Symmetry: C2
Subunit: 218 residues, 2 copies
């Protein structure tokens, strides 16, 4: 089972339960998916079995079609939130990290056309490789963070959270109307443009502001 860690690799003591995620949160990503924005945030969830340490080799399933990377800012909740105001949300954030919301894109496309749930495409084992968390105190302005994903030496995604359609705080406030977010829950804030396929053997370099993690698909 996955365990939360700080950037240095130290174990953190928060419980692990779920990851609440937003789709269609960057306009350029909405455009490359051929979709449109939604009136309210598009929400889905990944279970504990999706979570894994991004610093270790990242396993992807081989039989379900192509697996696409979606780099995203991850937010660690340190205090439980239910129907929480924006101010309560702000005070509840423990740290920030970077994840890949790995997606079986072909399946997802079929689910969308059939009006079917996304879990098989978004929730599968290991579909959420994630970094250690950076303290709120050292992270700076969360809504201005840079994210970059380089695969085999080529930049694939490079973006900044300033481009979020629904900003972090109101987003988390919104999510808490539906789901109690326990201490130790993680929130994924969406992916910018550049989403694409990965295959076994690819080398990944991932950066969150000035900080780097490296790994390999395998």
């Amino acid at each position: 089972m996955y365990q939360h860690r700080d950037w240095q690799g130290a174990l953190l003591d928060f419980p692990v339960n779920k990851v609440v995620c937003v789709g269609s949160n960057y306009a350029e990503h909405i455009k490359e998916m051929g979709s449109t924005a939604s009136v309210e945030p598009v929400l889905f969830i990944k279970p504990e079995t999706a979570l894994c340490d991004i610093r270790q080799p990242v396993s992807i399933p081989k039989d379900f079609g192509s697996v696409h990377h979606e780099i995203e800012l991850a937010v660690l909740i340190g205090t439980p939130l239910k129907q929480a105001s924006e101010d309560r949300v702000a005070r509840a954030i423990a740290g920030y990290g970077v994840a890949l919301d790995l997606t079986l894109r072909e399946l997802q496309a079929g689910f969308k056309k059939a009006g079917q749930p996304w879990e098989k495409a978004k929730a599968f084992d290991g579909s959420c490789p994630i970094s250690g968390f950076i303290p709120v105190a050292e992270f700076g302005d969360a809504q201005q963070a840079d994210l970059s994903l380089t695969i085999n030496g080529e930049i694939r995604q490079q973006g900044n959270t300033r481009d979020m359609i629904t900003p972090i705080i109101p987003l988390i406030s919104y999510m808490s109307r539906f789901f109690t977010l326990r201490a130790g829950d993680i929130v994924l804030t969406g992916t910018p443009q550049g989403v694409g396929p990965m295959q076994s053997g690819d080398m990944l370099k991932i950066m969150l502001n000035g900080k780097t993690v490296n790994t390999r698909i395998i």
Copy 2:
């Protein structure tokens, strides 16, 4: 806080994690799969809370299955040995919200995964439950029978269903599987008095 129990209410030693569920698994109502998180779970014997601004909330009575040993890409034989017990649950669904998501091709989590959306009973051990593919399920609201069905009518039976699920999601010991709902799904409201039956074992509760 929700913890797993046996039918009578004693604590079972299994952690609580997630609930893996199937849609459209009975005719009158590749398996459609979705998941509810731990925050969906609550004790069915206690008054049941439903949300007020999300539209109609509908009951779906279903046979619930407690996983007692971990399953990943497991054979039907391994699955059978894995089951620790059986219970009954309501898969509460915000139907109008869901009708919206289906049309737009959005995920179902808001409609299926919301807090308290899995009221569930205690579990009866496998040895004492008899044939789980023959189980009677019954839901009466305010004296009127709303759902009445039997698991023999499952489109995909329990064992193959759980085997299929494990191809996608690892099922930890303590995970619960929901098997689908028979026909008669309908809205519930505050004040509703509920009588639930699993093979004649009766539990009563109420909404609000």
